[PDB]
Design a binder for these strands. Sequence first.
DNA 1: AAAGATATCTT
DNA 2: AAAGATATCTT
Lengths: 244, 244
Amino acid sequence: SLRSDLINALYDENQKYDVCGIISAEGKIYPLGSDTKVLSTIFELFSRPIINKIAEKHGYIVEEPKQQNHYPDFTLYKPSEPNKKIAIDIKTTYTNKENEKIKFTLGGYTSFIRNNTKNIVYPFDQYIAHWIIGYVYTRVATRKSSLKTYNINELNEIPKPYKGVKVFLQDKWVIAGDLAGSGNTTNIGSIHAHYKDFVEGKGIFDSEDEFLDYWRNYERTSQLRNDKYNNISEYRNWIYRGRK
Amino acid sequence: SLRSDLINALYDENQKYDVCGIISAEGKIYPLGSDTKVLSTIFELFSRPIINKIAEKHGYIVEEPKQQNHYPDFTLYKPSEPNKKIAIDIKTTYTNKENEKIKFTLGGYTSFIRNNTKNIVYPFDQYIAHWIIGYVYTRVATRKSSLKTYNINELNEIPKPYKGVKVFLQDKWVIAGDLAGSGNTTNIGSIHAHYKDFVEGKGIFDSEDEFLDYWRNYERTSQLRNDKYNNISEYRNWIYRGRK
DNA sequence: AAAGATATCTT
DNA sequence: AAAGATATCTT
Ligand SMILES: [Mg+2]
Ligand SMILES: [Mg+2]
């Protein structure tokens, strides 16, 4: 499948390669920093050619947002079936010691899931799947060595700010949790679990429909959630009683 | 001085080098994406080496934040002058055409400038200068970036997502404006002017003390600002009224 | 303008 | 946890 091939390519590529810096056309190389803003950018750039390569093999068109505040990172679709689009979003997070619990922010809950055309490349209803390619890296302490420039002949000497990158591909709804992933930027939070749980998809929602409904009626502040629902249990009781 | 040296170094380096992709230890080069998040990250990484080079040359220790959401990008100081720290923050924005007005987001106005230690590496009072290194780049007309990899031989054939870059170093207060830079993330907005004005430092505040007082008393919503002040004029009128 | 999107972190 | 930081954009 497009899915199996994509995950095989990512898993494979992720083990045989290591990004160590940005290069100038003049051949000068600049080291990488240890914070997620940097690694997030790197993993996205890294994944681009792989996604494109695998998509092409299955006859899929790949499109990136034309504007900045638009989801998803990649929109795939065959010319003959425009209303069956696949959204692929790359998400990153870090861990301090391998095998700790991790969590991701899964996108806003007040944009395209509530308004079919808000901050999204194509109307939400034209997508049949929302895939998350999650990267987890163990953070490494920045040393003095990563504060100078390098030359092409020194590629092997440049220190990396990450240690053990792990990658997975999973449907957004499957890994979605019941607590917000951010306050003022109102993001959906993922389950807070170990990497294997994301790969295996041991989430809390029974269906994508339950996921959507939960997040479409989630109130922005605990104050507003006090009389409604603050988690999946309370949401199910709320549903049972008639949504009141 | 440290400041003049840093400014000279920034002009040269930037005038001599153009970043075109990220590179793996194995020599494989991945091209840059077009979205602002990418360039914001690249310019920050492009500057680290320069800042560290000039800092060492002047007896200054350079420190980056441990927590990822702490200001500033770089804290410079002599071990002998602990309470004479300099803060440097890197900001970027784009222009579609080389001579349009630009503006930057300059950091929050509700964190450390109101609460001396919130989200800052060292207490605000230990800093005696706050510089902003701003990069302005002109986007390219094409909305479609390259989706294949390149090798060291092809450096000259990799398309760049930007057409031209300008940089400047200036004190934060000198270029601060009176309108917020962001809403839910409560950022200070800078003046909305031409590149030349940021270089020359043609701001709106009469002093850093005014800049600080203005932003320490600015309200989050226009509803609350309407009974206080919404711009420099109204703020000055608010001072006359007795700050009520 | 002003408010709220885009991604992720911290306590 | 929930709320509010980190950059910067868009409408
Ligand atoms: Mg930084
Ligand atoms: Mg900064």
